[PDB]
Amino acid sequence: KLELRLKSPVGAEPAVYPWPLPVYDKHHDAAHEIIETIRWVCEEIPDLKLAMEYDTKSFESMQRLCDKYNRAIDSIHQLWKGTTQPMKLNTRPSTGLLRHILQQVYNHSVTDPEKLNNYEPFSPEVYGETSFDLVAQMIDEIKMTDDDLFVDLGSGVGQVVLQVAAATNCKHHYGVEKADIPAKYAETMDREFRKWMKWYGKKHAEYTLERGDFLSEEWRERIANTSVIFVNNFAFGPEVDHQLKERFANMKEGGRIVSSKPFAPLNFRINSRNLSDIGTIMRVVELSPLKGSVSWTGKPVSYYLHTIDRTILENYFSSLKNP
Ligand SMILES: N#Cc1cn([C@@H]2O[C@H](CSCC[C@H](N)C(=O)O)[C@@H](O)[C@H]2O)c2ncnc(N)c12
């Protein structure tokens, strides 16, 4: 054998689900993924929504839903052979669809999520996921163009890179991750993302997910030539952050770093004793908290935007030529 099938709206291979349908965690299962998938394709195609205008325990009841969607997809496909313009194919997903796609990719890839908590505590290996909503905020505030290169340093299972790649026109997106468990899941995330995006008929920008160490010699130059870095450095600690500062000091004017802990103080005043500090070459601002997003600390969740700006330093030196 028994199985359920959803035809792609753009004629990719159908999505196949075994029966009984699996459960992913306390709040996500495959039956709900199916209903939401039908729902989202309905948002991509008005005619399908019109054609679609009820029990997850029952095989028959779910086959009935799948067949009703599949028959409607067949009629849409015939509409497209007639006068009707077929859905535009080269487009990015809406934010809503993207959220659903990443959820689905994660659930099909991260087969045993508890294995992601088998890091050494109190180490730079601590794993935590940045939320979809934070990443969406960064995407909206940090305008990227096709001149930009994007890197997630310590990319985990890769979902920050996938979201940015789906949403922006950067020339390339990278993630680099050192630990074996998340880098292995990242390989599946990559394959599942490419598959599901083709299924929905949606475009992404170029991206690569790599197993590596972002403190390596190779990565010094890569960081220097990156225009937008995302780095969830909340548990990296002061030694690792110091090393990252050494690498950021070679970035180009206007390069930007978005992070969970600031690399320089927000109140940095250049003076005689701090000439060497990375605060001499960057503006730092705290991004606006998203409404009602509390951290474990109780206070709202804090991300920081750093912009490389050596005029700070140039002006310090021009000032020393004056009383
Ligand atoms: N020091 C150090 C290192 C620590 N990481 C990784 O950074 C991650 C921080 S969790 C953030 C995950 C995702 N970007 C998100 O925000 O949702 C962990 O997976 C850890 O293994 C590294 N990876 C590559 N090279 C390194 N040198 C390190």
Side-chain angles (χ1 to χ4, degrees), residues 124 128-130 152 154-155 159 177 212-214 230 232 236 240:
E129 286 173 12
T130 304
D152 179 355
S155 53
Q159 87 295 344
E177 175 51 62
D213 175 348
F214 59 64
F230 174 80
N232 184 8
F236 286 4
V240 171

Side-chain angles (χ1 to χ4, degrees), residues 177 179 181-183 185-197 199-202 204-220 222-241:
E177 175 51 62
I181 289 163
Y185 286 139
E187 291 179 22
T188 303
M189 290 277 295
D190 185 14
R191 295 180 313 246
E192 288 280 352
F193 183 75
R194 291 171 195 281
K195 184 190 77 180
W196 279 106
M197 290 285 286
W199 194 91
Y200 288 100
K202 297 285 160 181
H204 58 87
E206 295 201 344
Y207 76 90
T208 309
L209 293 175
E210 311 178 15
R211 188 188 261 91
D213 175 348
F214 59 64
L215 298 177
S216 78
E217 204 67 10
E218 193 211 23
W219 272 95
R220 293 179 176 279
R222 296 187 65 184
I223 288 162
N225 293 324
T226 296
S227 78
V228 180
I229 286 183
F230 174 80
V231 65
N232 184 8
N233 64 324
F234 193 97
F236 286 4
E239 167 59 20
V240 171
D241 283 337

Side-chain angles (χ1 to χ4, degrees), residues 146 148-164:
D146 65 5
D148 286 306
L149 296 167
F150 176 90
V151 177
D152 179 355
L153 297 176
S155 53
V157 305
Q159 87 295 344
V160 177
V161 179
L162 303 178
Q163 182 175 351
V164 181

Side-chain angles (χ1 to χ4, degrees), residues 47 62 64 66 87 92 97 100 103 114 122 130 135 140 154 183 186 227 285 314 316-317:
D47 289 354
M62 287 298 292
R64 190 182 314 145
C66 291
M87 155 178 137
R92 308 315 184 87
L97 173 60
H100 172 67
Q103 181 63 240
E114 165 56 12
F122 311 112
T130 304
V135 176
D140 291 339
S227 78
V285 307
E314 286 148 25
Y316 179 67
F317 278 102

Side-chain angles (χ1 to χ4, degrees), residues 27-34 36-52 55-56 58-59 61-82 84 86-87 91-114 116-124 126-142 144-146 148-170 172-177 179 181-183 185-197 199-202 204-220 222-251 253-256:
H27 291 126
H28 297 92
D29 70 20
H32 195 249
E33 174 185 315
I34 292 167
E36 294 291 338
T37 300
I38 289 159
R39 209 267 274 195
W40 279 105
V41 180
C42 282
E43 294 297 309
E44 302 181 276
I45 308 161
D47 289 354
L48 179 71
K49 191 159 176 188
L50 289 163
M52 302 302 289
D55 178 41
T56 76
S58 178
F59 171 80
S61 180
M62 287 298 292
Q63 200 182 48
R64 190 182 314 145
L65 177 67
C66 291
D67 283 353
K68 177 169 189 61
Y69 161 80
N70 288 336
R71 295 195 304 273
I73 291 288
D74 295 332
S75 71
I76 292 312
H77 288 162
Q78 288 297 326
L79 216 46
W80 295 353
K81 296 168 196 267
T84 304
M87 155 178 137
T91 82
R92 308 315 184 87
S94 65
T95 298
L97 173 60
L98 187 49
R99 191 194 288 279
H100 172 67
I101 293 179
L102 293 170
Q103 181 63 240
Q104 172 165 51
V105 166
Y106 189 101
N107 288 329
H108 287 270
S109 301
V110 180
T111 58
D112 193 355
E114 165 56 12
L116 292 166
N117 293 320
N118 303 341
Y119 54 77
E120 200 197 346
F122 311 112
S123 81
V126 165
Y127 178 81
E129 286 173 12
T130 304
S131 74
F132 184 95
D133 290 353
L134 179 88
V135 176
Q137 186 202 12
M138 158 179 80
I139 288 159
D140 291 339
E141 300 192 11
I142 308 315
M144 281 170 261
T145 66
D146 65 5
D148 286 306
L149 296 167
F150 176 90
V151 177
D152 179 355
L153 297 176
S155 53
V157 305
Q159 87 295 344
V160 177
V161 179
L162 303 178
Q163 182 175 351
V164 181
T168 79
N169 69 341
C170 293
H172 213 107
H173 302 72
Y174 305 84
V176 55
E177 175 51 62
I181 289 163
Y185 286 139
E187 291 179 22
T188 303
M189 290 277 295
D190 185 14
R191 295 180 313 246
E192 288 280 352
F193 183 75
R194 291 171 195 281
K195 184 190 77 180
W196 279 106
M197 290 285 286
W199 194 91
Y200 288 100
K202 297 285 160 181
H204 58 87
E206 295 201 344
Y207 76 90
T208 309
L209 293 175
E210 311 178 15
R211 188 188 261 91
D213 175 348
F214 59 64
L215 298 177
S216 78
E217 204 67 10
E218 193 211 23
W219 272 95
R220 293 179 176 279
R222 296 187 65 184
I223 288 162
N225 293 324
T226 296
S227 78
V228 180
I229 286 183
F230 174 80
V231 65
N232 184 8
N233 64 324
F234 193 97
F236 286 4
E239 167 59 20
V240 171
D241 283 337
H242 171 77
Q243 292 172 275
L244 287 175
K245 292 172 202 197
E246 170 173 56
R247 287 142 178 87
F248 301 151
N250 290 320
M251 291 170 72
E253 201 67 8
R256 291 164 294 173

